[PDB]
Amino acid sequence: SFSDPRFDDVKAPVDECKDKDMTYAAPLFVTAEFINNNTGEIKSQTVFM
Amino acid sequence: IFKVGDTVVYPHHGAALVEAIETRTIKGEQKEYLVLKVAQGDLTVRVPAENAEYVGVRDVVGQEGLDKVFQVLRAPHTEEPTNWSRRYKANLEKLASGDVNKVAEVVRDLWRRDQERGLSAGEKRMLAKARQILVGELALAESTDDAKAETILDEVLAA
Amino acid sequence: VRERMTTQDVEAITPQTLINIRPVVAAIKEFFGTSQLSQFMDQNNPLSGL
Ligand SMILES: C/C(=C\[C@H](C)CCCCC(=O)O)[C@@H]1O[C@@H]2C=C[C@@H]1OC(=O)\C=C/C=C\C=C\[C@H]1O[C@@H]3C[C@H]1O[C@@H](/C=C/C[C@H]1O[C@H](C[C@H](O)[C@H]1C)[C@@H](O)[C@@H](O)/C=C/CC/C=C/C2)[C@@H]3C
């Protein structure tokens, strides 16, 4: 299952991106949860999307 | 069997801590879950204490298992299947068994192989992952500075 | 993900090993670069920008 989208700060400001041809962006983070049904284990990890 | 803050070993997630005993009910029964977060993967694991032994969470080893794997790692004359695919499947199963003696046997065999030859990217990742989780289990079984535990494992390997 | 939830062995998987973010990042990249509704912004005056 998936849960909780959440962003970070941008990696570079606007004018530096226009200078060095980088794209203005920010990373996505997602709390993922893997559930086994028979024994039963949940696993919470912060997947960089 | 367990309290809060105890160090424990999983099948293969390295050693870990229990952070709390979760009382999350399910189907209207307050099953005694336990949050158990690990070191390497930076993830938590919730397991009910009923099937804790069914999934096979294992308490840390002591001095008897310590010198047992110190004699297992020092034990010579281990033969190997010359079919490398059977070898890879075999020690992959032995690594996934979660047994400390089997993990020590795997890392000492693969150390004796790549010490002479230098094996593979896959076998090198195999040795790296298994040696890492065995070093973590050693540095939480004796609590003696995992870098220094790595050096003392290098000491008893060539000895 | 639902393919490799079977061929991978049980009590061995983790969500870091399940998810491949490559189709999502490729879909975002192919949407912005080279798609006819994501246009190169013209600016010869602020009225034409607006
Ligand atoms: C035909 C068309 C766009 C034309 C290229 C431009 C508009 C045609 C109308 C006109 O003749 O004025 C369609 O556009 C989209 C869907 C598919 C079609 O694209 C198409 O099938 C054709 C191209 C689709 C993407 C092209 C990307 C690259 O092609 C070059 C570089 C990249 O983007 C293009 C940038 C176009 C900006 C234009 O802006 C217009 C003026 C100039 O013609 C251009 C500066 C302005 O009048 C502006 O107000 C109008 C914007 C169009 C509104 C959105 C339409 C949806 C530039 C031509």
H helices within A1-49, ranges in order? Answer: 14-20
- Decide if B44 and A41 are in contact by the 8 Å CB cutoff: no
Query: Mind giving me the DSSP string for B27-45?
Result: TTB---EEEEEESSS--EE
Is some CB atom of chain B closer than 8 A to the CB atom of A26?
A: no
Structural resolution in Å: 3.4
Radius of gyration from C-alpha coordinates of chain C: 20
Distance of CA B96 to the CA centre of its chain: 9
Q: Cβ-count burial of C44 within 10 angstroms (0-12 exposed, 13-18 middle, 19+ buried)?
A: exposed
- Asked if residues A34 and A42 have their Cβ atoms less than 8 Å apart, the reply is yes
- Ordered by start, the domain boundaries in chain B are 1-59, 60-159
Q: Can you tell me the distance from the alpha carbon of B65 to that of B71, in angstroms, rounded to the nearest whole number?
A: 10
Chains A and B form CB pairs within 8 A to the count of 22
Q: Cβ-count burial of B47 within 10 angstroms (0-12 exposed, 13-18 middle, 19+ buried)?
A: buried
